[PDB]
Motif scaffolding. Structure first.
Motif, mmCIF file in Angstrom:
data_model
loop_
_atom_site.group_PDB
_atom_site.id
_atom_site.type_symbol
_atom_site.label_atom_id
_atom_site.label_comp_id
_atom_site.label_asym_id
_atom_site.label_seq_id
_atom_site.Cartn_x
_atom_site.Cartn_y
_atom_site.Cartn_z
ATOM 1 N N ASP A 138 0.882 -1.315 -0.098
ATOM 2 C CA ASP A 138 -0.026 -0.175 -0.265
ATOM 3 C C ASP A 138 0.749 1.358 0.098
ATOM 4 O O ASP A 138 0.378 2.325 0.168
ATOM 5 N N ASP A 139 2.057 1.046 0.016
ATOM 6 C CA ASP A 139 2.972 2.343 -0.202
ATOM 7 C C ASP A 139 3.747 2.494 -1.585
ATOM 8 O O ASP A 139 4.504 1.337 -1.775
ATOM 9 N N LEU A 140 3.860 3.273 -2.211
ATOM 10 C CA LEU A 140 4.182 3.411 -3.802
ATOM 11 C C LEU A 140 5.945 2.969 -3.593
ATOM 12 O O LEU A 140 6.319 2.304 -4.479
ATOM 13 N N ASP A 141 6.450 3.968 -2.714
ATOM 14 C CA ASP A 141 8.075 3.640 -2.619
ATOM 15 C C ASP A 141 8.168 2.260 -2.119
ATOM 16 O O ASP A 141 9.153 1.412 -2.529
ATOM 17 N N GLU A 142 7.624 1.551 -1.361
ATOM 18 C CA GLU A 142 7.583 0.539 -0.621
ATOM 19 C C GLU A 142 7.085 -0.778 -1.767
ATOM 20 O O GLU A 142 8.227 -1.488 -1.849
ATOM 21 N N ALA A 143 6.003 -0.396 -2.465
ATOM 22 C CA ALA A 143 5.980 -1.480 -3.566
ATOM 23 C C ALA A 143 7.118 -1.444 -4.589
ATOM 24 O O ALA A 143 7.246 -2.634 -5.046
ATOM 25 N N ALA A 144 7.530 -0.341 -5.007
ATOM 26 C CA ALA A 144 8.776 -0.495 -6.025
ATOM 27 C C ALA A 144 9.807 -1.188 -5.382
ATOM 28 O O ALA A 144 10.413 -1.795 -6.028
ATOM 29 N N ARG A 145 10.256 -0.661 -4.092
ATOM 30 C CA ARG A 145 11.343 -1.677 -3.481
ATOM 31 C C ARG A 145 10.955 -3.049 -3.367
ATOM 32 O O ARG A 145 11.825 -3.905 -3.920
#
Lengths: 420, 420, 420, 420
Positions: free
Chosen positions: D388-395
């Motif tokens: 549910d977090d864009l940066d976390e999802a990309a990581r």
């Protein structure tokens, strides 16, 4: 760091300082000087033919880590029979000691010190030194002798006791007891320590000394504290009134150029460069070194003619720079003042005319007589390359050194003259 | 690559070669020369006041990519009215053309070529060239004109037809028809192509030419093949018997030093270095350049005095090297042979005495007279720095160039002499 | 270098070996053990309340250069009053010693050794060591004690006297006199040296020792040579019949994992990597380490289950690897032989089922039972990742370690299974 | 630069646009389409069996610099007989054109354009383009046709005439004469230019075009200006009401994945990475690409489902990403809005269940329905890796791609699940 450039303080060999302490009544292990293995044998059998220590009389920073040409480690040895004493002395006397300070131009061990070997119980460091912070002599004491003292002084500044002394009232025995009891002497030998310190201070005031370092002052296995090492740094300026000490100066420990310079009252500083100099005053000497190193050069061996020196002094100076072959381009950088510049102009005229100085003399003369000096330079009509700006002079001399070393490679000869 | 060093073959401006083709009867678009916009107007209105092409008469490798000082792209323009023809010509005549070959020393466009604009239907490349492989003239033909020919020749060697010719029997028309039909001419204009090639070969044999390149030979929209470009590389050696062609040589396209050198039969080669030379023969000239570049130097502008030149020739030579200011150290590297070395020794004596040659002359003289040359050098008693080994001479001259440029930086003057 | 991987030979604290020498009748300075400052005071006042030495009982390579948490330099101190003895002991007992061998996981100084301080006159090194070159015990002696012996042995191989001994006939006193006189003992105390060496050899044969190093064996200031240090490396294999010596083993000097491994007869080798292992035999352990380091990995802490170990042994093993948290991927790399592979398969089944081993177990099982082991692995039906090639197993385990540490960063969970 | 990501505007083959200009009455060279060499022969003999030009119908940026598999340079050829026309056409039709835009996945030349060859006298560039700066259609004209127009536009902005048009009042002929006379038309053919521009604008308004570029519009050798190239970029949105133009769309010029995506109204963007995506809206698509490139990853081929798409659309989407094998880890990054997130949750459930999507689906769903989407994801009970977090999802997705490609190397299989 330190001074280096300004004066080379007289450092005696160990046995001379040991004798000086002996004549002053300071408690001291029995010691003698040996120039050949024969008297080494005689002294070893005199002291009991057992439990003897042999020390090398070489003036260098490294003495226990140095190497002899014969292949022996260190300058100190422990012998137990006169025969092995002769054997080890045959590998010291007449041999050349290689230490890191010398690198490859090691000093030669001329004599050795034969002493009785005593077992220390406690190791104290002690030192009477003149200093500006306390405006006079200072008694420094600590209980960390036998080991390098700077490390413990920096890490543990409290352990280094420092006590100043008032010169007009002299030293008082109560002060010596105070120092001994603050170091941590046994309460039964404090009187002996006080007497030893009083005698050492009397020696310090008598011989015009500057720093008497006893490291380590050690209590013996039977009391009666005995000094082991007695390093003494004297005062250069006290040559006029301390004849006995300064006459015993060992000259083998320095280059013959240094001896010749000292014979005429000229400071000499050799280096590893190839641009000789001739500078008035130590300060402008460091200035010239820094400005040459800025332009990529490196000074070779530069001098200091002091103040009021005669023309013969600067003639001997130029002889001294030209004696070294590693020099390529010489700059006389003397500003005026006490040293009358006209005598330097006369000296360069005479020295270039006599010794056939073909190397580029990048002169830079100023101060209190500029008309006479420049007029004499112009009248002499030589290749005396005049300059009048410090940065320009350094640039010119560095470029001339490069030109000289380049033409030597090209196997061609050059002559340098002022632009028309 | 190419020759460069040996001879600069006479290349005429476009309009001269176009006129030469015109007088020979070769089919050619109508063309005229304009020195000012006024006659450009006159010719433009003469040709119909429409559909006119303007070409720049500049001798350079890059002519369509060059730049004028006025800010115009390329040397070719297409105008449709005499007024705009005047406008564009005002931006060409008297203007300096900047191409990559010149870089910054661009040639000046003195005249322009005004021609009728014709639409080509097919583009053929053609070239009559003397060559050693076929021991004589060779007719090269292809159907890839208008485009650089080396690329298609290397990628498609079959497409480049080459036919040799027997000189004593001349050229035969049947050969021209064969070449035309192998290129792929239309079967109705082959006769015109054969006639054009016969006329071109007659011109090639008459004017002592070396390479006549027609690129592109193009069929018009109405037949009657017309040549567009007529590049002609002539023969340098044919100056004695081809007076008309060689008199029309344009001298503005080369440096005045080149003109002066050609006035006395001296080859000149300028460069981007700072070590002048003076070499006998092109081969030893490349040898000297290579050996100087080996030692880190770079020759500046070096000459070639040919064979049997008088002393005045080498005096003019030394004047020519000393004219350039970018030179620092000059080496005369002449080995003997046809060029009698003693006259060069006399020439160096006279030229150093007269023009006040203060730069280090690193001479290296040998061959067929060494006693006379060296004796004259010694008798003249100058700074004529003698040397006798090629590698040693190159080392010495490169080091002397470095010494000179270093002393110029140091703002000091030097004089060079042989070691005693 | 050395062995390291194979066995950790029992090294006792200094005071235990000193007591062992005392009971054997070897001449020895008076010494006692202190666990608290109180008995340190009692012993100091017992020995004369003056001239006392305090030593730290820490098993490490660096003991005079180590640092305590309290901020004291070295493990040896020289005290002269019981009060300062208490003061210094309060900074040793219960304190953690930081040496370069430990780095940061320093051992704790549990007790101290209080001894009388004696002044050595000469320093001899001596050592009775079992060795293969002389197929038995060897008496090594030299006159360079108190200093590291490898340097002088390498630089001066002659100075290191080595004498072998015939075991069946024992040691002969004449041999001891020969060794003493070849070292250079004084001719009046050779008998004492011979008696000391005979007693030391009797101790060496009695306690199943491997190397008894006396460094330095020193003559006192009044004769009666006394040993200073008594390093003893024992034999690991002699645990069964030397109960008294091996019971006194100090376990605080090693990690609790090491103690647990020794409780079950498992060799343990911790490291600084993150790939655990479980290897049969030291040789394949070094092989696994080398092959893992080849593929860019680094083993974390790997074991050695010996031969014929039960299933409980390997269960305890897996407990031991999983105890450390720095491990990521575990490979059991056991080849067959004495260690019946089927019990290891059973052990992995039980240990993965019980301790919930979620980390990737990259098994590689072979030897003397492959059918039973693989059949049990397949029957258990887990993530037991089978492999059968050493290089492939190392590649797989290194990649799995990287995958695990990557997924931990990504904050995601993974499960590993054989490809279908 | 440009748009790229948002929509792929319909570009027709040359012959279709040429026919469109023909039917509109625009003056145009005679042209025909050839699918085989036979009708190429027929048309060549129909046009006069001489002076014919052959053009390749390939949609690529490079058409004159491309290479065929047969080994022919460029897409344009000039033939003069029908036989060589057949010969060259046999090397174009059915052949694959290699240009720098394609690199290695060249488009296949299906048909060719056979046209009469006309000699241009002057070259004008012209273009009717919709634009926002002038809020409508703009007539751009210049006299620098046949050459790339951006260079001359940037260097000489004055030479590019731009005239806006008022749409409600249409285009006026006086405006066309003004444009023609400002470009510099001959004063005798200005009327023809005005008529051509009026017809072109009528075509521009009729076929819902966006940019009609005639480059170069050239006057012939006999007047009657004729357009050479007729590039037409249409409007993607005008598919509903322009059926004739959009039905003639060539689908061979794009990947079959592109055709399938267009069959369901899904934007597709292939790339050179290995992280597939599925993004709602172009803006978040560039956002996802940038954030993936930040973490060291590179997206492989990502989509755009538009707004209000059905569940079948996203099922086809996931089929489309999974069709490519270069993809490793797929992230569905749809934020809510018009695209109801619950249908995407249903679509991922169905597509993972059906196509057996074993690759890590790093979902990130939000917007206007989060409860329904997350509830459905939890009810389906799969490896649908929620985030549910864009940066976390990309990581997470970049790390999962690395894990997948690492496990493929290790030849082991993995399964990914949320941390407990």
């Amino acid at each position: 760091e330190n001074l280096y450039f300004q004066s080379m303080n007289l450092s005696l060999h160990e046995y001379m300082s040991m004798e000086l302490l002996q004549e002053a009544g300071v408690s001291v292990p029995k010691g003698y000087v040996a120039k050949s293995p024969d008297e080494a044998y005689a002294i070893a059998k005199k002291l009991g033919s057992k439990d003897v220590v042999i020390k090398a009389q070489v003036l260098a920073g490294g003495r226990g880590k140095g190497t002899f040409e014969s292949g022996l480690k260190g300058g100190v040895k422990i012998v137990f029979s006169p025969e092995e004493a002769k054997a080890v002395s045959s590998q010291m006397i007449g041999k050349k000691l290689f230490t890191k300070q010398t690198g490859e131009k090691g000093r030669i061990c001329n004599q050795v010190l034969v002493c009785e070997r005593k077992y220390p119980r406690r190791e104290y460091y002690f030192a009477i030194t003149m200093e500006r912070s306390f405006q006079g002599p200072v008694l420094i004491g600590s209980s960390h002798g036998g080991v390098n003292i700077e490390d413990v002084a920096a890490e543990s500044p409290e352990a280094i006791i420092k006590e100043p002394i008032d010169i007009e009232e002299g030293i008082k025995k109560e002060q010596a007891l105070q120092l001994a009891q603050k170091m941590g002497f046994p309460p039964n030998i404090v009187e002996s320590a006080a007497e030893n310190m009083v005698k050492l201070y009397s020696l310090f005031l008598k011989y015009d000394a500057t720093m008497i370092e006893i490291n380590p002052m050690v209590e013996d296995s039977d009391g009666a504290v005995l000094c082991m090492d007695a390093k003494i740094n004297f005062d250069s300026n006290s040559a006029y009134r301390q004849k006995k000490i300064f006459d015993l100066q060992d000259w083998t420990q320095e280059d013959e150029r240094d001896k010749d310079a000292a014979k005429a009252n000229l400071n000499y500083i050799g280096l590893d460069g190839n641009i000789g100099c001739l500078v008035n005053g130590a300060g402008l000497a460091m200035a010239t070194m820094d400005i040459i190193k800025l332009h990529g050069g490196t000074p070779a061996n530069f001098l200091d003619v002091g103040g009021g020196a005669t023309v013969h002094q600067v003639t001997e100076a130029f002889k001294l720079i030209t004696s070294d072959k590693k020099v390529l381009a010489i700059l006389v950088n003397i500003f005026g003042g006490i040293m009358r510049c006209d005598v330097i102009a006369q000296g360069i005229v005479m020295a270039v005319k006599d010794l056939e100085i073909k190397i580029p003399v990048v002169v830079r003369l100023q101060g209190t007589r500029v008309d006479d000096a420049k007029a004499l330079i112009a009248d002499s009509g030589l290749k005396i390359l005049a300059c009048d700006d410090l940065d320009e002079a350094a640039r010119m001399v560095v470029k001339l050194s490069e030109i000289v070393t380049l033409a030597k490679q090209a196997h061609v000869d050059v002559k340098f003259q002022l632009p028309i």
